[PDB]
Amino acid sequence: VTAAISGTDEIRARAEQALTRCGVDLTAVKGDALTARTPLTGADLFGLRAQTPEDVDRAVEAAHTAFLTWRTTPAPVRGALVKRFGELLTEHKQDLADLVTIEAGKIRSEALGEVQEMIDICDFAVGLSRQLYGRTMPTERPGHRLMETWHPLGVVGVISAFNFPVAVWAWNAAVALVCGDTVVWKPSELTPLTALACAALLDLAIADAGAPKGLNQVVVGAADVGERLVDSPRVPLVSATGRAVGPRVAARFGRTILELGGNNAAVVTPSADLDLTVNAAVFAAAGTAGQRCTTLRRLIVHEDIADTVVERLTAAFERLPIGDPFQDTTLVGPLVNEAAFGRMREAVERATAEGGTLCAGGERQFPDAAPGAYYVRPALVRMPAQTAVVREETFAPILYVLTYRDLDEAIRLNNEVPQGLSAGIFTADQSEAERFLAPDGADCGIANVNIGTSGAEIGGAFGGEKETGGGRESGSDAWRAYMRRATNTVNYSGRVTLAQGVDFS
Template sequence: MPPVPPASHTPADRTPAPRFPDTASLRARATAALRRCGADLDAAAATGPDGADTVLARTPLTGGTLARLPAATAEQADAAIDDAHRAFHHWRTVPAPRRGALVKRLGELLTAHKDDLADLVTIEAGKIRSEALGEVQEMIDICDFAVGLSRQLYGRTIAGERPGHRLAETWHPLGVVGVISAFNFPVAVWSWNTAIALVCGDTVVWKPSELTPLTALACDALLARAAAADAPPGVHRLLLGARACGERLVDDPRVALVSATGSVRMGREVAPRVAARFGRCLLELGGNNAAVVTPSADLDLAVRGIVFSAAGTAGQRCTTLRRLIVHEDIADRLTERMVHAYGQLPLGDPFDAATLVGPLITTAAHTAMAEALATAQRDGGKLLTGGDRCFAAEAPDAAYVRPAIVRMPEQTEIVRTETFAPVLYVLTYRTLDEAVALHNDVPQGLSSSIFTQDQREAERFLAADGSDCGIANVNIGTSGAEIGGAFGGEKETGGGRESGSDAWRAYMRRATNTVNYSADLPLAQGVNFL
């Protein structure tokens, strides 16, 4: 695959090379942050040779290795599940507000160690400083939400047909929750699941991405400190490892719910295996998100929303904007402004406050991006800006890449395929019905938006025959969801819902109760028997 040449709008040498931190200084910074959180990296480090029994902690800032950690064995994974299962038998009987007190303590510790966790998120996931701090704030916010929820796990009283009877619905703890998380939100997604699961009376076994083990060590240490006062041992267990660890969670019948965030390919494997043992799945998978821009749109507002959604986190959010569907009358004007805005994005060291675009997680991610751009151009697309790799001399093992914009003649197969990198495809439409059809003609259904000042267009997009996504926005981009709403999507996105609203119900089991307080025994539906 030949490299994608830089577009004429973005000469490769226009940005002076920043000063990058070296791997040794990043290792020292991570070690200090972990120590303040309560985790000892030196004590946790593996001593044997590299292999299947080790997890390499590395940093995308340089591509260098930060630490070698022992991977959990199958026996250790089973023991962790057993610990959580035994702890559940006690934890489910603790009153929910007392369970909420543990999450409150966790939120307080997260607040106290916000900078430490943000350091680790930047070091391991490559996020710019404001986004790393924002991710930790999201953890704090979900703890606040969960604490309030601990006093609001409401059932209901239902009108029944029989005199002297009461019909009710109650909710009870479910069991062990297995959390499998991805690299791009290494701590927030864990907190969405764990804070809610704990107040619901469940215990948690967490298998984080093998790309972000250090952030997981820090979170586990903070939760252990929060739980030390009155929670049973085993209320939370951490499993560092690769595929085999996840498979233990997927296949073990003691794990009542598997909440898995990752690729569609992973979801296709996880879902049938959990279903085969009649367990529950909560899947957060791919997203090929689009925004529609109508002729009435405020283009200043639209450009700001589009650039953050498409280029933020270096295009590595599940909610990243990947398709821009623009009315043909304004397409040239909008793309010109987009190219100009992309040209102003500072690329480089994510610890530098001026940087807005950090590295891709691996050089393999850059290879996938280059292949997608080459395919798009073979399909008739025109690369308007970006796609070139930068700072290869300064950081040869890292992948700093300029976000790309490609004008496409139609929605080809590569446009319908999620590429986890900052590639934005621009398509045009004539009628809003055509735009909605283009929008929905992809296998994924996570996040969507429309930029318009016409209420009819906005309502059409939000209607039952409008966007088919789990998230549909008006005059904001596709990324940056608040924790108060349920997060998730449809189709190949998996159908799961996490975080706010009534997503807590996935972590509990429902019981319908009929209480007869009369001296008679009437049967429902008028049945006579004895």
């Protein structure tokens, strides 16, 4: 139950080294308006310059200028830029992953994985640059041709959260760039440094490619900066990941991609492989300290095996190594800030008040080793019913355990929450697996068999349903949200249908 944590100064030096290697000019970005910080110790690292709302508008207009050139640049040439950027990400993978650990608190292997996701979406987007497929199709009209074409849309506003500080932007920017769009990115106020590093690498790729300078810009600021971006008439698409954005953008006839959180469950049936299940559940519940939109928060377990599953998860949660995310031994790093810790404790108290039993975890670990940081053991809570606290997502590592008998009851328990991001079923039974994925099964955007709620990869469309917000990012044909469809009828016959047969001559 004890851990050595890196000092703020050692963290700052590592951040500075990483930023400089990624080509950031520290003198130019430093200032006294905002502050970079680290959840590893809770402390401020150094001050940053901020953009004003007026600067956001200047950025959007510059991005629109760039768009006017980029939209007629051939998609395969646009893909060459993205290929160059992927090369630079590859070259600086370890440097960027350092920044991700520093700002989001993720363990090293997860930080590296997030940067690799960026590299993987660049590879995918380079492929898409020769596709972006529309259709050709028959027309009913003699001597006509009909097709559907896809065109670049305009400036895309990207609003990202602290928890995936680089991959969410990459999913959006790699795709948007190859689609002939330009990007203005408002990163989380908690994670500016990762964004600055990403932007500097992309600016080098842009300079190497001879591409337009305003293809991507980062706006560093607080909430008034984000609002100005959301409200811009020159931003036809806003992608927001990790609540008010949908209706405000719809009001000005813009488009949104929303992925707004998840309250994700897994069903454990009587035939589940318990070794597989426990391993999967622990990773999905405890990974990233319970701060993924896809984190496992509800486990719906058949009454015949619930006691044994709870025993095993209790033991696994008790053995989880919690500590500095730079240490190879660490599996759980810190929560992002005090507010997060407070919400976690409030939820666990309310759960025991609504009838629950705390089985494992929930306590702050080694508070005196880093007093400004909140390292916590993931909580396992057995619940007699799916009460309000279980239905209302807390962004923390709390796994509520519910029991069921009939699979249709498990499905109902999965579906009855307002969120609809991901779901999983652990079963050896062919029919149960298929029933879960059927139209009357789990209602979520992602529905998996024998893999947890974080089972997703670049090639799939990523997003959810219900209050998650309906958007899709990354794979399949999510790229269509970054373009506009045109239906084109071409007459080569020299004639038109004459109304009531009349020829006006």
